[PDB]
Symmetry: D2
Subunit: 392 residues, 4 copies
């Protein structure tokens, strides 16, 4: 199948790409792949484990391997043997000039940046470019996944964001104001009849406009922020107290990271996005709002080794307060990189099973699920499970 | 409803007894009460929150206020203000001499408190008086909960505990060695047709003999080792890793504390039982067996402050290892106590719905679920929600 | 001896008060007291354990005990017996209406409080009044200490703070724009030839203009900002790396609490002073500046149980990266309180040994030691051991 | 300078060998070296940085290079490319068959490997071979260091271990029952006018028979258990509540690993030796003997990356108990490796300065230091400073 990646040079895109061909070459085991669990067997008939990549990007590199070798020097999240060996497959992957419209002043790492608006461009011609780039790559088994970096919180207007006739006029009114980059991608792909997936905390297809579109064109889309490590753990441990009819007092979340992602989440603009999702998760799991603290600080030495520090203050039986801590220590590119593949694969399956509109049974992967207030891990996982069952 | 408690002076028995009144008295919230959760609405038409207690005990102390007193001063797990408002009551509840038998090794610190073995009553005699105080205690709504010390691995008899003739023959042929104090209390309770629950890792009513002596009497019994906190977290977070298809390479479980629990668990006799119960757990939650280490250690200064250090070493995409920690800091007696009243309330209802034999669907409370393989908390929680549902 | 405490009603203050009588009487041990370490044996002939109390307050309570209860009733930071024993003494202690000149944004409560600054007073009639309660109270063996709410970064004016005649001028000039609370407290005591010390990060006597008026008066003042919890460990553990020639790439520091302490140190004004002492420490111990983050966040669940989480990322041989974690779990008031009485006897003894001005040999108690660069805890502990001996 | 290493095919020997070459090539930094700290400037006059490597191994292979590569294979504790660079050098390092006369009865790999002690040779017959391997390599700049597998306690005698004559007689009297493998090396070093160092919890030259051997042999020696991971932290943080007169109630030391160190320490007679130095620490530093548990457990998945879990339960002012945690995440090999050089260099210095017998001032490198009680890390460091200055 073919995958069209946004921000195709990121640590997670290339972990994907390196991963996919490592397994295809029967080199790498398939650990992490949710699509490979014993409950979804048979999925190879509609979504076999075979991949073809391409996509947009705004970082100036040669191809996809030279972007993959870069992040590896910093983190080395996989042995040098798997990279050299997949060095060839990716020398042919070459991202194309994309757009970065309204994505925070937390952006600065490319002296060269004459990209979309860089070239004195219009909404119209920008959309035509992106459309023309996915178009020439896309086939019948193609999926578009946003994996670029955290954008700020755009200001929704129901005029240009609340009716496909609006957003389409927003493009004709050259309204670069309300237009965000992650909307152009979703609109691009949903337009082209391709299934879309948003791993990032950006709105993307998460607007009324770009909901009316898929549904009107029969496209099953899904997302709103990979739930890959910390938040996984909190959406898995919080209901534990609701089951034991204890009350939580305060939850503290504290995360420190330093590569391109930690780099952009530095400011309180774009960072302000993703922070939210990992905060609000808790109300909708308990039915009460404990005092919650969630912060993400820069920490250059860890690079992609996202570390997270949690403490939960909880009360039981006789009014007592008690205490629970956990430290998460992993490399984001490892817990996220399969998800990008599981997603493509469930989305391809969905497409073929006549699934259109949003896939609220894919909540399992995301921390801001569209059209659902299912946050509990084993409960999302059951819904994910009972969905497939019902379509097999 | 009434509740007989073997181990009447324990910190869990008094703290259950302390809260029971303090709530019925209106001087305490209903925090931590699983049967108080909105789901189980209307169970109070069968078992309303109203208790009266009594029980067996080897540590001879004056009344019930005294014991609770003794524990509040080491642990202070609630307010002394409550201590004295629960004064009159617990002054009232007086324990009865029970039996200690062929198993316990750390089960001796209350000096020459020798009772049954010190002199020489007969097996059938103790069981006679044992059933005496109970029988005389019981009534319509009596539930027999064993919340006493933990005995070691019960040297099982294929000729004695394999059938009712057996146990009834041992009990007559005075086969004292294959006999343990808790098999006893479970025999009397059941033989009187009163529901039974094993909050310890002790055999209790796990043998065939007693099971078949429960089936025949039409009585419901169900439990084995309350599932309180560390282990409670081990079966809520373990399925995480499985949900996402990660391998689990090692789990470290190190527990510390030393009131009366950590005391007897200085010896590996009755210590083995409890620990084994937290370890085997992992296997059936993910199908494979990671290298496991589980240890309980005497730390007197923490007393009931059961504190735990756990660590999960797991493998992701491409084989990268990743690390995960958590520490648990609390009083076993406050997170234990409301699961004594819950089970009792739960054990009544089931009775008045016609239930008999091992309530397999009550596994949600114990780490050693009788007659079932469902260890996952969310699996157990849903089950329970259901088993009530069909019996409503 | 006699002791005046700015902010007599705070939690530290009364934990020093309560403990004092608790120990004067014989109903508590002297554990945690530094002047009771063998080395300083013979200090009692100069500063024996016996205390008389007074202070200033802007949070009018009827008496010290009344303030001892609210901090206790939320924190239960010591036995109820100790309090019950002391209540009668603390009830006899009454705070005198204090100043709040330039106390940044955090001092929200009194709202409309009138009796000192707010009572239409000038700075002249003000400064004298603060000198008229410590005039009357104080004798020959009195000493002044600041354990008040933290004060924001003081806008430094070299005219009125760089000269003693300037600060005088400041007074009849009603120069409240350069005047802050501590400064006038610290100005009065020193006026009075009364030894003075500062437990808060506030400038207090840490201006040129006061170092002069003290030496010109012949009085020994001390420190700045008490070093009670996490910077204690920092200035203890960091050199471990320096002595082992490893390099610190980054240090995380995160603290949470939620009482008055938390309250005012919830805003940028006040809390900026605290952080900087905390964080800055690192620079002076290893001789290099690694990446370091120091934060404080308002957790209204812990209160004075301030909890801190630290992360150290270090390199050794061959450039390999390594990590070390730690969590600080203790009551602030309790690790602070003994310090107060120590600083008291260590001040009189200076007074009694002739010493005037900054006693930079008491660096050991603080985060920002006045006039010195000894920040290593064992360094400042030898120093202070040296200093007693020489004056001895 | 020459350095002969017992247990030369170990990850720690190998790491110092790799890091040595690397550094002398100007291609590897100087981090981790105590001897390269400014204070010790001029050290270069007697013991520059250049090493010549040889040593004894009982698991003889082709060279040091394939042993280093093996270790690297699993641990990956340094840049792949450094081993290539150094490769040709270690390749030309071929240890010889050492000997493990009495290591208990718990090894698992050296199987058929024994051209030495396992070839039918007397005590006297093995020494003269062992003494013949180090001489052939030795000069006047050569030193012998012990970094072999840990050993259980030995069967001491007042006749064989209490005198070099009584000892010597034990060698040509075939009393193999007393002859430790370590003593046979240290004895071989020292009896050649060569300095020795013991980085293990194993005996070595720490018996009166050999302590006296170096006095008359006019050779300095030192060590017994190089203090690296956790225990460095212990003797560095424990003094902290001393200075503040706080009381240490209990300390918990929980270490997990799994290489040839972890593999060997399986049993406890072996484990006896190590945990001892990992326990006696606290009493010898505080004056207090708190409740201490020091434990070490296998966990194959961590290989060399030893992981320590410690907890301190400490009492404060008005009896307040409070807690302190921390986690040591790091690689054993890497922190210990540079110490081997250091110890080596500081051993050369002491020989040129006429120092014979134990070098008590070298105590800063060890957790079991000979002939002194100074355990304190800051105390051991200063003591190393002045010892060198004195000899400067
Ligand atoms: N565990 C995790 O990895 C995880 C989990 C949840 C969310 N996420 C989110 O995934 C996203 C990407 O993660 P990452 O670690 O790979 O960060 P990254 O910055 O390394 O990858 C972003 C890549 O996209 C490029 N890019 C940025 N804006 C773009 C645009 N408008 N058009 C095209 N390319 C653009 C960037 O220059 C870079 O090449 C972030 O939003 C992050 O918050 C990651
Ligand atoms: N969170 C927890 O407390 C929890 C969870 C899992 C299992 N358990 C098990 O439940 C038990 C009780 O816990 P605890 O903290 O109150 O221990 P405890 O020592 O405080 O109380 C045990 C009580 O049982 C009494 N007893 C012991 N043997 C007896 C006998 N033969 N007959 C009558 N009385 C007897 C003891 O003297 C004491 O009064 C232990 O066996 C423990 O292993 C506890
Ligand atoms: N471990 C700690 O508790 C600790 C450690 C080091 C430094 N500090 C700092 O020292 C102070 C004492 O801490 P705390 O927890 O006791 O806070 P606190 O609020 O309990 O004590 C402050 C007290 O001083 C009073 N006060 C404040 N400003 C005043 C003024 N201008 N005049 C008169 N009274 C005034 C307050 O109303 C209150 O009674 C804080 O500034 C804190 O930042 C605290
Ligand atoms: N952080 C540190 O690494 C640390 C700290 C304290 C102590 N130590 C000690 O240093 C030593 C080396 O550590 P390692 O982790 O590299 O272990 P390692 O097992 O990988 O290396 C030990 C080596 O000694 C060899 N050996 C064992 N018995 C021998 C004998 N009789 N004669 C000759 N060679 C023999 C083994 O074959 C092996 O190559 C161990 O005793 C360890 O406990 C290391
Ligand atoms: K990432
Ligand atoms: K090691």
């Amino acid at each position: 199948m073919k995958v069209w990646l946004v921000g195709a040079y990121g640590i997670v895109s290339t972990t994907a790409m390196v991963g996919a061909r490592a397994i295809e070459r029967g080199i790498a085991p398939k650990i992490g792949l949710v699509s490979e669990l014993p409950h979804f067997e048979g999925i190879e008939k509609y979504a076999p484990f075979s991949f073809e990549f391409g996509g947009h990007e705004i970082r100036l590199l040669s191809n996809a391997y030279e972007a993959a070798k870069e992040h590896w020097e910093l983190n080395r999240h996989f042995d040098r043997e798997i990279l050299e060996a997949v060095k060839s497959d990716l020398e042919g992957i070459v991202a194309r000039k994309g757009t970065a419209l309204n994505c925070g002043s937390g952006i600065k790492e490319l002296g060269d940046i004459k990209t979309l608006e860089g070239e004195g461009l219009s909404l119209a011609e920008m959309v035509s470019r992106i459309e023309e780039d996915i178009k020439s790559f896309a086939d019948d088994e193609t999926v578009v996944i946003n994996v670029a970096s955290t954008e700020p919180l755009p200001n929704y207007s129901e005029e240009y964001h609340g009716s496909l006739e609006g957003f389409e006029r927003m493009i004709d009114e050259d309204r670069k104001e309300y237009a965000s980059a992650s909307m152009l991608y979703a609109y691009a792909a949903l337009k082209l009849g391709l299934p879309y997936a948003n791993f990032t905390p950006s709105p993307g297809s998460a607007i009324p406009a770009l909901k009316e579109l898929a549904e009107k064109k029969g496209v099953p889309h899904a997302g709103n922020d990979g739930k890959t490590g910390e938040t996984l753990v909190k959406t898995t441990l919080a209901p534990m107290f609701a089951y034991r009819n204890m009350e939580v007092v305060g939850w503290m979340s504290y995360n420190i990271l330093g590569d391109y992602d930690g780099k952009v989440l530095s400011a309180r603009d774009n960072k302000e996005s993703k922070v939210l999702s990992k905060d609000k998760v808790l109300e909708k799991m308990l039915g009460y709002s404990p005092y919650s603290i969630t912060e993400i600080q820069y920490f250059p030495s860890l690079v992609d080794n996202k570390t997270a520090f949690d403490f939960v203050h909880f009360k039981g039986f006789l009014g007592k307060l008690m205490k629970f801590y956990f430290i998460w220590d992993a490399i984001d590119a490892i817990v996220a990189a399969p998800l990008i593949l599981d997603i493509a694969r469930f989305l391809l399956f969905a497409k073929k099973k006549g699934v259109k509109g949003v896939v609220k049974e894919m909540a399992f992967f995301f921390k801001s699920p569209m059209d659902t207030n299912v946050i509990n891990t084993h409960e999302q996982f059951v819904v994910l499970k009972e969905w497939y069952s019902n379509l097999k």
